[PDB]
């Protein structure tokens, strides 16, 4: 096993299309978070509707539809193929920043002049449901046919609500199966889940992750077998080469630390490079960084 | 050894604009010579022009605003926002050439309520020196500070002007690629992407973006002329055709007349095979 010999801040966001810029622990420590991008095991299986590229990280394309109550798309997968519904909670890389209004740019995939762009305004209320294999929007352009575009920001539900992007979105209509990865619960004994955070316009200021997107086409690409209950990581500065901290990877597809107290992977350099050290027990125990 | 990505072509992103590829082909005059600056490293690992590792650093933009009297533009960055120092242009910086580019980009700052986006109207016309560090645009929004965002499409520069995403911009260049050998086609990725001209419709790139990550990741030596890769199906795990991978990092095909690597499928995965001469003969493809 090894993982991506790359320093932090050159690792892609896997819930959005951004660089990430540093670490951190969730003010709550026991908060346990259910994303359904950057999931992935270590021995490569792909959870939720992670994608394999970072370049299919919070994306969406469908072919536009027009009913009496407004328009949609009738989503496909990225590629243009079919949704597989039966195995996942929406197309692979779709958003899955929950709670928020969605607005997507988005272009006509066959294209001879004027702006090609489209921005579809997608609300998360009742009848959001793309796990059925439609969601609604509207726009102030007039976008039609085959539509394929990118999560461009995001916004409150309704005036004067906050924006949580440590929620995800209810893929269902209804007691509908979505086939949602599960959740991740710190794993106890003071460990912390790691948080990689990136810039992204939230309107009403950072978007976490639990894996790079890297580190996800790395495991899917190696197909490495478990040989341990979890994998010892040291986080090395790539100049100096020295160990700046321990972190723990498990099977499931989440890394941990043990937080100082008052501090966290937060403090560190955001350009060290992760490394594979050694397999080892669920409770090894970390020196706390 | 050296290897090349366990990933299927589908699942390969453009390393010229965010985008998956989703074919191969070779260029209608295979003479083509070709000086992208995004996609290019060498086997080696050494990134060349203005290539940066992730997917998500490709043509993209980020720097301050500045707005006087004068004019409006960017004294650009680097994405993280470190300074630029006077390569052609800060890494990830778009390579498409001879257009206009609309770039929308957000305010890193931002606390305010509202529409965060704003798109940036580039031109390659005389004060787009992004070697010096700066490029001018024009706006319908009012952008301030600090922004970082990315290409979002690509117009004509002129009235009835053609858009050719083969060019690049007159900005330290990573070289020219020349067609090698008796034969060879360079086959060029291909990503849909908004291109308002005719019937272009696409971007091409030399190396996937996966590509060159996993060349700097690995750090492999080269150990001889060039690199064998067999195109294969992951299911069957037929080989479907035989491809040339140079050191200086890109790769050839021998075509089959009247066609090519535009008709193979798109779920296929490289696979390192053997070092070869410099004139090792590929099976037509
Ligand atoms: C005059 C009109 O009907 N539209 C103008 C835009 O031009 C149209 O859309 C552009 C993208 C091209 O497809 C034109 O052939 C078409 O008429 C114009 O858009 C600007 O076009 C410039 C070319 O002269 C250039 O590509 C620029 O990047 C693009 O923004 C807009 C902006 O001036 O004005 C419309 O009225
Ligand atoms: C000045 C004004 O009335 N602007 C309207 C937009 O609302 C502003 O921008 C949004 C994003 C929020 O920051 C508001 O607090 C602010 O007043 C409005 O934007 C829409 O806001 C909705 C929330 O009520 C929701 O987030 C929606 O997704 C977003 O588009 C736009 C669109 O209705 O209209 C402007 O006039």
């Known amino acids: 096993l090894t993982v991506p010999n790359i320093p932090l801040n050159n690792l892609a966001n896997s819930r959005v299309p951004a660089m990430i810029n540093k670490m951190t622990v969730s003010t709550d420590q026991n908060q346990v978070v259910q994303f359904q991008n950057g999931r992935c095991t270590l021995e490569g299986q792909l959870l939720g509707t992670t994608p394999v590229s970072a370049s299919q990280v919070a994306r969406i394309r469908g072919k536009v539809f027009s009913t009496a109550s407004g328009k949609g798309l009738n989503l ?94 209810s893929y269902g209509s209804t007691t509908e199966s979505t086939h949602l990865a599960p959740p991740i619960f710190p794993p106890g004994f003071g460990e912390a889940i790691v948080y990689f955070m990136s810039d992204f316009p939230i309107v009403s200021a950072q978007v976490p992750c639990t894996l790079p ?22 986080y090395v500065d790539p100049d100096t080469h020295r160990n700046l ?8 597809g989440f890394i941990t630390c043990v937080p100082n107290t008052g501090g966290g992977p937060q403090n560190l350099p955001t350009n060290g490079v992760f490394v594979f050290s050694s397999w080892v027990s669920r409770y090894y125990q970390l020196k706390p960084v």
């Open 76 to 169: 496909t997968e990225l590629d243009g193929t079919p949704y597989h519904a039966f195995e996942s909670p929406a197309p692979l890389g779709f958003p899955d920043i929950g709670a928020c209004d969605w607005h997507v740019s988005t272009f006509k995939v066959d294209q001879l002049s004027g702006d090609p762009m489209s921005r579809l305004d997608v609300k998360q209320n009742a009848p959001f449901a793309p796990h059925l294999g439609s969601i609604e929007f509207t726009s102030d352009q007039d976008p039609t046919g085959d539509q394929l575009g990118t999560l461009a920001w995001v916004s409150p539900s309704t005036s004067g609500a906050r924006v949580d992007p440590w929620k995800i979105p």
């Open 213 to 234: 997107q890297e580190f996800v086409s790395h495991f899917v690409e190696q197909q490495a077998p478990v040989r341990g209950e979890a994998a010892l990581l040291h």
């Open 245 to 252: 901290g321990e972190f723990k990877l498990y099977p499931d």
